[PDB]
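To the team - magnesium ion complex, inputs and output below.
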Amino acid sequence: LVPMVIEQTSRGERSFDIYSRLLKERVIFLTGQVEDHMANLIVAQMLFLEAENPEKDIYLYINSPGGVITAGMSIYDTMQFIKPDVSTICMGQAASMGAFLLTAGAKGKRFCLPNSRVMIHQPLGGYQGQATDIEIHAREILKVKGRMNELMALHTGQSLEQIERDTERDRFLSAPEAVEYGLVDSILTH
Amino acid sequence: LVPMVIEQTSRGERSFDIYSRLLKERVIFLTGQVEDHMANLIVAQMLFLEAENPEKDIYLYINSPGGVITAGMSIYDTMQFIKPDVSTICMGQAASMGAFLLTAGAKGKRFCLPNSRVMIHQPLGGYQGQATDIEIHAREILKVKGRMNELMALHTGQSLEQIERDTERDRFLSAPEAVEYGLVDSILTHR
Amino acid sequence: AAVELAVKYINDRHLPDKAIDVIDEAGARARLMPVSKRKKTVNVADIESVVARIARIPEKSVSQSDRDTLKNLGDRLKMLVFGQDKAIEALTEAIKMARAGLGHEHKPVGSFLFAGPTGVGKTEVTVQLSKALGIELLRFDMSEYMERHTVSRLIGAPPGYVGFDQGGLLTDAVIKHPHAVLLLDEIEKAHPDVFNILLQVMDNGTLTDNNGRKADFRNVVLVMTTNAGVRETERKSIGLIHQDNSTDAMEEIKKIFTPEFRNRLDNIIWFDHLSTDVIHQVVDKFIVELQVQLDQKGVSLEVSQEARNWLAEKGYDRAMGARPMARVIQDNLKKPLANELLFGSLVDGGQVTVALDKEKNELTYGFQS
Amino acid sequence: HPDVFNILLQVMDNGTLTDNNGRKADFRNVVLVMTTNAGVRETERKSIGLIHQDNSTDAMEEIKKIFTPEFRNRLDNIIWFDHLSTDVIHQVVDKFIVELQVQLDQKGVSLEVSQEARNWLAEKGYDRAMGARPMARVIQDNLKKPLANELLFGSLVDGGQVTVALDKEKNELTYGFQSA
Amino acid sequence: HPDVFNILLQVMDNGTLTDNNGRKADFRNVVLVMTTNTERKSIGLIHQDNSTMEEIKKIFTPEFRNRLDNIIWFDHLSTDVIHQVVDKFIVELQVQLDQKGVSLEVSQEARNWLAEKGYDRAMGARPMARVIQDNLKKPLANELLFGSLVDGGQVTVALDKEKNELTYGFQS
Ligand SMILES: Nc1ncnc2c1ncn2[C@@H]1O[C@H](COP(=O)(O)OP(=O)(O)OP(O)(O)=S)[C@@H](O)[C@H]1O
Ligand SMILES: [Mg+2]
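Output:
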């Protein structure tokens, strides 16, 4: 159940869901494992907000533990295309795709909470079967990692060699240390 | 839970969901595995938008990981039958059935985002039973894959032989490669 | 001429009586006419003037003073209503056609629907037209008719009811003022059933009240300003790929108005958003009005060119139009002068001036005596 | 109001209407003609499907839902007016021009319109939904507006033969004014 | 109701209204004043304060606000100001009581309790009038008429900390 909040208007009060009223204020929330339906839902919200206002920033709260990589790419390609800068405020955990989504955020508007934690590791698409088919599948995952790492380094600016070395094994970064690494430009506290 | 997106009109405020609000602008959404029940919904949206404005261009966002082949044919035939040109913008992923719909989009209106992918492969339909039933069933699946190459070749413009050779083993594609391969025409213009 | 003109214009009397009085009224007018012995004969020109007075309608043959006024009617209006030239063109052409004699014998002089963004000058052009032509303006606010049963005041209540004796407003107004301008502001706000009355008004130029009397709308200009246009000015599409939106725009009015009502409209004028250059002219008009009011007391106000440009930009609004300019002109220019005029140097002020300081970012009001 | 339709029932069947004072009217020699617009909207509707549909019967079904059966059962006939075709619209242009000439006859100016110009006017103003009303407006803008400016302030102040034609190169009307 | 706002819009825009009898109501010489502003306690386990530029924009359409000449704002009654407001009632009663011939010895000590009891943050000073109506008027009224203070009277006020009520002293 979602609480219904009335939004005062000159015509009169109209009841709306808590998420609905937040969307009216350019606030979009993200949570749960990334899914095609979930990714497409956040995509429709981004497009509607851009048409409503093409300048005001659209907030994007990421509190997800990671999900399918392919689903996440749709969100990333929709965020870059839209003219308004996305404010990727990380309010909690941020797995591989979680880190990728917040890093895609426009520079100068990315914020992080004091006690948030961003976990970055490599993608895992392990499949078992005939060696012939695995070759193409094996080639594909590296290409996504290379493409993601290339785009990731473009946003952050760190050396590609260092990023792959670190991303080979699971890495945990604190909110203070995250800004040092360049994941988030600033921290929001007050 | 679907978010609500209030709209303003002289008659009053017509509250609507996000999917229905975008549908008023001819933006159809194809999400998840294709199936007999979701295809019926997509074709229904195309028919309604066709009567409203024939001149306007429809927009289909394909973000599906593949589904039953039979359901996909219904969506493709509807798109070609309607006069309005269907613009297929690949978002996130384009599996065999998703790619088929992406190719079906009118020439000059097909676009692919920078990080989207396009995977094509041979049908994986299987049947178990008596040898006589398998023989007739085997003919149908072979006729379907072959039919797919002919229709795909028509839109893409490639030769039947290369498509058949390419589909022998699982293959993936990138966003710029799709334009070269003929699945689409050009990357979506940056705005 | 008398018999034909009377039936064409005089509709409240029968042919033998109305025709005979025209002849009798013409001779009587001729009796006091020979100030210089001009009593030779009564011609057709005299019959047209006497009938024009009985029915209170402009004479058939346009004079040479009425003719001169219609030549520069559009130019005279542009001096007070800047922009929207096509609106003036349609109004001026219709008035010229009806006087020349090419008008519709069973329809009003003009039936023009005005739409567009708020504050673009819809009621001003109508009010200025009435003042320019010396025509009594009949103003009916359609905001008092937000219910289906409000039409009882336009044509009157039926017999046997509380309002039978009082009569209708619109019918009596046109009967008292045969030659007038009809303005229905915010027509869309009115109930959809009020449009049905206007149908016969525009098609046959006749309306019947509860008393059986027929109102003549052939010599009245019907203008119905609406705010529908403001809704489609956004031209925004919720999609990854944008669209022109030209065809959908301006089609909402067809949904709220039956095609019957629109099919009999002479034209559907659209008011474009005020241009930035036009805002400067509007400021000059307001300042001129303030100067005239001040000139009655004897004070003379002078505004620097730089102040006008900054003042216009301060109150420039596309959505709200030039309505905000009234507030900023009152709050900034008029309010400082109120205290001085009542008690101060401006009691008998002369050669007053005003200006602005760029670094200060505010106005500078000076006074002299 | 639909209830008002009931008043006409006795008129169309008994042929008499009684007033407040008890006086009985006689409508035996009265041609009762009622004009309505009921099915125009339903016919304008467009089907939504692969195969299109016919909405000819929708026009009459709407009328049946507005007027009571006891009202329509005593009507002598229900004539369905049909949209004005391009051919009849051409004739309508001639009718309006004839009316314009009668107005112009009083002023003493005789207008002449070339057949080519008439066809051009018909195409510009031919709208099935709006019928013949736009023809008046098209003629009004093209012919009445220039004449009015000239009449009150130019060559046509006095009676003078005027002519109209069409420029094929520019596809626009050409007016010629003669003063005599 | 929104229809009533339209009526006021026509007034502020043209300065005239039309009666249902055909009359014309002249508004060109009327000062139009619109006043805008909860009694129920907070619906929570622990009660909380219910005290309440963008608020007007939300509750009023721009077409109505844009027609206003100037929107005047009124400030919440300060604690210091409240002491001045209660003084007006005491002096008002004094001039009223002067016609009878008595002088109230009341000082700021009495007004201290009356202030908090009379003034409420939400209700404001509306109960203030009722406070004097019963606390200060009713007790004196009975003694003034029984004959003790009819031919001239002297009154006073006494507030005890423990009693937490306003006592009175009568002399003549
Ligand atoms: N084009 C213009 N030229 C001159 N003055 C203008 C113009 N547009 C607006 N104004 C001024 O601003 C006022 C606007 O009020 P109206 O004439 O009623 O027009 P309006 O605000 O468009 O009408 P509504 O509100 O849409 S019925 C005018 O009376 C003028 O004082
Ligand atoms: Mg107005």
